[model samples]
Target chain A: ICLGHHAVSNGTKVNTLTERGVEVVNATETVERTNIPRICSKGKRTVDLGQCGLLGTITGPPQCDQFLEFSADLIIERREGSDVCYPGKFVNEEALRQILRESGGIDKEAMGFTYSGIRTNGATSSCRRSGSSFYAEMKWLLSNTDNAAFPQMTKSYKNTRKSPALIVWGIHHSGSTAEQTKLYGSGNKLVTVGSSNYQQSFVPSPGARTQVNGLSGRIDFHWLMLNPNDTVTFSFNGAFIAPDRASFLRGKSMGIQSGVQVDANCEGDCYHSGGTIISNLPFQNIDSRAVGKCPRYVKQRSLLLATGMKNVPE
Target chain B: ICLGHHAVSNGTKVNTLTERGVEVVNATETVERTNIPRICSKGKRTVDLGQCGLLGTITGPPQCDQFLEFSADLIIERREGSDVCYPGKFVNEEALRQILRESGGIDKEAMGFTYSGIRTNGATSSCRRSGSSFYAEMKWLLSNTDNAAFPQMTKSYKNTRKSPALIVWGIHHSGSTAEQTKLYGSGNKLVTVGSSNYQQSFVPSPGARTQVNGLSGRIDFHWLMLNPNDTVTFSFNGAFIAPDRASFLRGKSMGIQSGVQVDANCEGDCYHSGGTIISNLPFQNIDSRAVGKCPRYVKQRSLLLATGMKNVPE
Candidate 1:
C-alpha cells in the first residue's frame, strides 16, 4: 500500500498530515504483500517471471512529480556542417525560438543545434553574455521575424531635464555715485530694495556731488564703504543704493565742499556739521523749525567740474 | 644752276656727257634762271628755308634705274622701330608683296607690326627668327587663304647616293688548289671576276672536246702581277687552262694546275683596288689579257716564302 501527504497553511499556522490506510494490494493471491523496491538499492537483485522479462511491477503510484514510462526521440538534422535536433514530447518553445533565431531560420539547411568543437573539453560552454552578444541576439531576433514572430516587450522609466542652480556673490562699486547711478539708469535694472540709515546719512552734499562728477564714469560709489571690519551679506536677489542729504552730516561732504569747517583743536566732542552747538549732545536749533527749517532749504550753489579727470575706480 | 657731268658705260666703252650745256641751249628758254646767292652774303640763311624743302620735286630722270622724289604732300612711310622706308608717291606693289609673303599674310598682332610705335628717328630693332616665328607665319598664311594662296615650292635637290667601294680579297690557296676551285665555283660575283684552273680542268678537263659537266661558266678575270723589285702589271679577260702531257715534264702541269700563287708573304707589293699605287708608272689595265710560258711564276712563289705578309688589304 502507498499513501501521500499534503500540507496547508493559514497565516503562521501550518497543518500537515499523511493520508492513512489506502491499500494498494497485489493481484497474485499467493503473495501476502510484495516488498516495494528501494529507490537506492543496497544489493543487486534480478526478478524474472516465467515467460516475461522483468515483469515485476510497483504496486503503488510512482513518486510524486517523478516521470514514469518516459522516452525521448531526437531527430538529428545535419545542416551547413552542423547538427540540429528536433525534440519530441516536451519542447521548450522559448528556448527553441532562441536557438532557431540564433541559427538563422527554421529551414533545416540554415538551422543548427550541434555543440561547437571550438573549445577543449571541460571548458565553460555557456553562451557569451556581454553587451555585444546581446546586440547580436537582438539582430538574430529581428532577422527571424518572417519565420517566427514574438511579442515585443518594453519598459517605462523617468528622468529629469534641468540642472541644479549655482550661485556666486561678493561684488562692490566704489567712488562716483552719480556715475554709478548713470550706469544703473542706463536701461540696466538695479534694485535698491533694502533701507540703510548709515548709507543714507553718508550721502555727499551738493558741492561734494559736484566733485564726484569731475571724476570719470568708471567710479563706483557703493564700493567706498567696503571696509575690512564692515560686514556685507550678499545673495542672488539682494539690493544696492546711494544715500541722500543726510550723508553730509556724517562728514561725507568734508573733502567735497569748500568753507565747511572740520572739528579740531577741541579734544572733547564739540559742535559738528559746521555749526555751533550749546551742549555736548546733538541738538536742534531752537530758532529754526524742527521739521523743515534746519537749513533744509539752504541754497548752496554746486559748481560744474571740468571733464578732464585723473583717478577713478575701474 | 649746278652743272654735272656723268659717264655711262656700255659693255665695251664709256661715254661722258655734259647735261648742263644741253639744258642751257634748249629751245624752250622762256623760264627764268635765278642767280645763286653767295654764301658770305646769305647772312645766316633763314633757319626754316636754309635747305630746299620741296617735298614733291622729281629728283632724278625717269629713265634712271632708281629715282626719288619729294613734295610737301609726300607721306614718307618709315617702318616703325626700323630703318626701312616706303615711298609716298609710288604704289610699291613689289614691296607690299614682299612684306605680305614674309609675314605669311597680314596677321597684324602676330607680325609684331601693329603694336609698334613709329618714331621720327630711324633705328634698327631686334627681331625674333626662331621656328615659333615661322610657325606663327604659317598659321597666318593658313588663316588668310582667301587673300592669297601660298605657292607650292619644289625641293628637288638631294644628296648624292654614291659611296666609296670596299673590296675584300682572299689570298690564293696553296698545295692542291682544290680550295681555290671551290671558292671560284661558289658562283659569287666578286668585283674582280675570275675562275680557278683546277675548277676549269678537273670538273671539265681542258681540250676534252666533250661538253663540260661542272666547270664554272665564263668569268671576267682581272689580275695584277708584281715582281720582287716592286714592278707591277695587270691582266684581264684571261682563262685558266690545264697543261698538256708534254708541258707537265718541266713542272708546268703542277704550276698551271695550282693557279697563279698569290704572294702571301709579301708585305708591300700587293695592292688592294681603289688604293693609290705610288709607282711612277703610266700604265693601266682595262679589259685586257696577257700570257706567260715557263716564265718567273716559280721565282714569284719562292719570293712569297722569303717575304712574310704584313696584312690583307680590305
Candidate 2:
C-alpha cells in the first residue's frame, strides 16, 4: 500500500458547480470520480468520466466548507509526461468564476487511505468510499503558502450536515495582518513544487566529492475561500517547508533562536541538508532522524502560533 | 446512493490458503478474477479489466485481507452480464488441495449489493469489489452455493484454532432435548429458491385475477481451508441461501416459539445464507418486514448472550 506515499494509481473524475452552470447532470456525476464539488483543472486530462474516482491520485487532500459561492470540478493531471500544480491557477477566468468575483464555487476533495480506521460513518461511511484508503501515515510532502491553500482539520466537525467545516474562514479568518495578508497572497510565494526531492544515492559522500544533504519535508498548507455558502471559521494561513524548510527558517519561526522562544526538546533530532536553521534547535531528517529531531509533525519546537498541532492530525 | 444500495458495483480479489497447496503463490492472487481458489477453467479469459464499477454492476466481487500469507493487486472490475460468489465452495474438491488440505484456509467473503437505505449495505461494497452487486437488493433474487460460497467471519472460537464452536455444544449450548436439538441440524427446511420467488407478469398484478410477488437476492458461494498457521479463531460454515436458507430449521437452533424454538435474536450474527431455526421464527421475507418483523439481521428483540459488539459486525 505504498504508492507516492501510501496509495495513488491513476484516478480521474471531478465535477460540481452550480449557479445553474456545470450541470450536465452535475457534469454527469463528476466526469466519474474524486469527491463532490470540485474546481479548476490545469492538468490530468482524458475526461468524460462520470462514475466518481480512479484512474489514480485521489489520496484526499483538497477540502472545503467555508464557501464563498463554492465551485466544483477539479484536477490538473499528469505524473510522467509532467505538469500537476494548482494555486492562483490561471490562463485567466471563466471555465466559470464567482469568489466575491474572480473565483466562486471551488471546493476540491480527495482523502483516501483508511480514514482513521473507519468505525462506520455516513451515506454509510467507506470514509469517502471508492476503494477508500483516504489519507494515511503522514509527511505527504511539499508545500508553501500565503493567501489561499485551505489547511484544516481544526476540530473534526462531527457531521454538521455531513461533516462540513474541517477548516475555512476566508481571508484566512478575516483578521488580516502580514500587510493585509499581502492581497490574495497566493502569489509572490506559493511553491510546493516537485515530484519530491529526487534522491539518488548508492552511498556517495564518503571521501567528500561534495553533496551530503538528504530530505523528507512537505504538508500542512492552509488558506481558504470558496462558498458552499461560507461561515464556519477555524482560520489558517502560514505553514511552509521545502527549499529545505525554507533556508532552514531563515524566514524565522520554529522555536526562536536568540531573540528567544525555547522549550524545544525534539527527542532524538538530527539534520544535514543545508542544516543550519540559524543554529538548529530541533529540526531532524538526516533522511529520517538524528538532525534537529522533531517529526510526528514536530510539537514543542515551539510556534505554529506556539507549540504545534494547531488543529491536530498527528 | 443505492446503485441498488449505495456504492455497490462489482469487486473480487480474495486470496489466503496454504497447506503446501492453493499456493501457486496462494492461488496467484485468484487466477485473475471471480470465485475461490478457482481451480482450472481455461475459458471466459483474456484479463486486464482495471476499471468500471457501476452505472449498473461495474463487474463482480473480489476482496482480500486476513493474511495466511496474503497478497494483493486487488480490483475495481465488471458486472452487467455474469459471475459473482464465494464461501466454503466445494464442487467436490481438488485442483490442488491443502490450500491447508481439504484442510483450512477459508475466510469466506460476501459483498454483493447496491444498497443505501438498507435493503442491505451499499452498492454491495463495490459489488463484491469486482464483478459485484453480489445479488442486487431485497433479494437481488437468488443463488446457491458451491466452488466456495463466501463462508466466513466465524467466531466463538473461544481457540481450537478455527473457532468452529460458537455454540454447537448442542441443545443450543446444551439446555439439551428438542429430541437432541434434532442432532446437527441446519440441513432440513432450505427455502429461498431465487430470481426471487421468480415473480413476473410484466403487467397483470394489475387488479387481481392473480400474479404478485417481486424479487431480490444473489451473491456468491465459497468453500474454505487456508493456513498462515491457524489459532486466531472466528469459525464459519453455512454459505446456504438458494432454495435453502437450504434445509432451514433442519440445521435447527434459533430461540423458542411454542413447541419448537422461536424468537431468536441473532447475537454477533453469522450468515452463509441459511441461518434460521424454529417453525422458522425467521422464515419470513414477504419482501421485508411483516411476518413478525425483525431482520437487519435481528438486533435485540431480547436476549444478548451479553452486552453486544464482541467480534461484532453482522
Candidate 3:
C-alpha cells in the first residue's frame, strides 16, 4: 500500500499553517515570511499566509470525511529557520512569467511541481484509516460526468441520505468555459463568484485562492456520498479521464494524471501563482473490495429498480 | 424522529457510569453504590458495579460506529439518590422470580422496563449527526438472519473491503439453541463459551455478563458493512421477524418490538437477573433514506451478478 502521491521521504522539512519553514525566492531576492493582512467582504481580516509548502503533520493526515471542515493543521504550516521549498512553491509573477517565456511552457511542470503531488506524510489506509492514494484515485474517477448514467446517479446521490461520500476539489482553469462546465455541471453549480466556481454541494469558504497568483489557493470543500447501487451515475463524473467506468471501476488502468487541480487563468496565455489548494483529495480510505464490486453492484441496483426479482447470480 | 425507544422524560434523573444516584430495591432493603470487586482469569479486578441503568450522556449519545468498543458512559450509571428506576433495571433475581410468580409473568415487561429503552437524552439525527431512533430501527431490522438470502450477504460482507458498515450487538439467551442460532447463526457463529455465544466477527471482551442474572451484559462489538447492492443477503439475518425482505426494506410496517436485546436465560422457567448489557443497538445513526432504498439495490446487485445488463430501471 503506497502512502500517497509523491509522499515526502523521512525527515522532510515541512511547514504548517501555524509554523513557517519554506521560503520563496525570486530572481533577485528571497520573499520573507510576513503576516500580510487584507480586508474582505465577509468583514474580516484575511491574512496573507506568505508562500509556504506541504502543510500538516506527515503522521496525522486529514481524515476522509474531514474535507468539509478541514483543519488548518492539514493545509498550512511552517518550519522555523528552514527556508527552502523542497516539494516546490510559487515564485513572483514576474519570475514565473520570465521562466515560462524562456522555457516556452516546458518548465511549467517543474515550476508547479511543488503544487503537484499532495503531501501524505507516508500515511497508509490502516495508519490513517483511509489510504491517501486510494482516495486520490476515487476523486479522479468521480470528477467526470460524461457517462450516460450520470444524471440518474446524481438524482440518487442527492436523495439518498448518508451515502458514503467523497469530497473532491474540482480543479479547472477559471478562464476555460469547458473547465467550468466540467467543474460545476448542469444543476450542480452551487455558486460562482467572479473567477471562482462552486458546486451546489461545495461548502462555504473564503475565495478559492490565497493570493490571486500566489501559491496558496482557497480550499473549498464539498460532500459527495455515492449510493453504491448507483455507482455508474457518480462514476460518470470521471469518465473523461478513463476509457469506461466499468473497466476503471475494476481497477484496470489508473488513467495517469496528477490529481491536483489548480484553478489557473488563461488569457492569450495561462497565468498561475500556484493557485489555491483545492480540498478535493479523498481524505478517507475505502475498501478496495467495495470499489471493485461497484460495477456488478451498479448493475444489480439497476435491475432491482426495474424488476425487483432475484434473477441475478452470485 | 422519535429519539429512541421508550426514551426517558425531560427531567429524568440520569446517573452515568461515573456518578451514582439511583438506588436498587430488594424485598426488604436497598443496595447502596459500593464498588464490589470480583477476580477472573484475565487478572483484572472486575468490579461489581452495583447495578445501574442507561449509561451515557443522553445528549452526546454514542455514535453509530462505537458499538464494538462501547464506552462506560453509554451503559452504566446511577443518579444522586433518585431511588427510582425511570426506564427500569434488574431487581435481584429472587425479586425477579418473586415478581414473576406473584404477577404470573405479566410484569415481565414492567420488571425489565428499565432495560427496555436505549437511553438518548433527547438527541436527534441532526443534533448528534445520527438519529437515535434510526439506529434502533436498523439494529431491529438487521437482527434477523433466517431469510434465504443471508448466506450470500455474509459472504459478500466478509469479502467486501471498506463497505459502509454498522456495528451491532446480536442479543441471545444463553440457554435457547434457536435464539443462539438467531444471534450467532450457522457459519456466522464466531465462538461460543460456557454461556456466551460470539459471532466470528465479535471482538474480544470480558464476557457477555456482568453478574449471573445481573442487569449488565458484556457487549461484544462486531462490524457489518453492507455493499448497497447486496442488502438482501444480509437482510436475511432478520427475515424470521419479517414477512419478506422486499416489504421490510420498503418500511411497509415496522414490526413492533423494542430495539433493546437482553441476553437472558431459560431453565424450564426462563430466569434473568437483569442480563448483561449486550451491545446490539445501532450505536450510531444511519440515514433512513439510505436504508429505505436497500431492497431495490439488493435486487440490482443480484441481477448484475447473474447477467451484466441495463435491464433495470430507476
Which candidate tops TM-score? Answer: 3
Candidate DockQ scores, in order: 0.00, 0.01, 0.01
For candidate 3 chain A, which ten residues in a row score worst on lDDT? A104-113
Q: Would candidate 1 be rated incorrect, acceptable, medium or high by CAPRI criteria?
A: incorrect
Instruction: At residue A117, give the lDDT of candidate 2.
Output: 20
Question: For candidate 1, what is the DockQ?
Answer: 0.00
lDDT per residue for candidate 3 within B58-120, as digits (tens), equals: 111233223212222112122221111111122132332222222211100010111121221
1 or 2, greater by lDDT: 2
| Candidate 1: Cα lDDT at B53 | 15
DockQ of 3: 0.01
lDDT scores of the candidates, listed in order? 0.17, 0.20, 0.21
Residue B302 alpha-carbon offset, candidate 1, angstroms: 99
| Displacement of the residue B185 alpha carbon in candidate 2, Å | 50
What TM-score does chain B get in every candidate? 0.10, 0.15, 0.20
Q: Is candidate 2 or candidate 3 better by lDDT?
A: 3
Reference-based lDDT, residue A77, model 1: 18
Q: Give the per-residue lDDT digits (tens) of candidate 2, residues B1-314.
A: 44322221222222223221111111111011111111111221212122311111111224211121211121112222122232111221232221212112222222222222211222233345453444331132111321212222222111223332111000011011121123222322122211211211110000000001111112223222222223222222322221101000111121111111112233212111122211223332212221122333333332212111112112
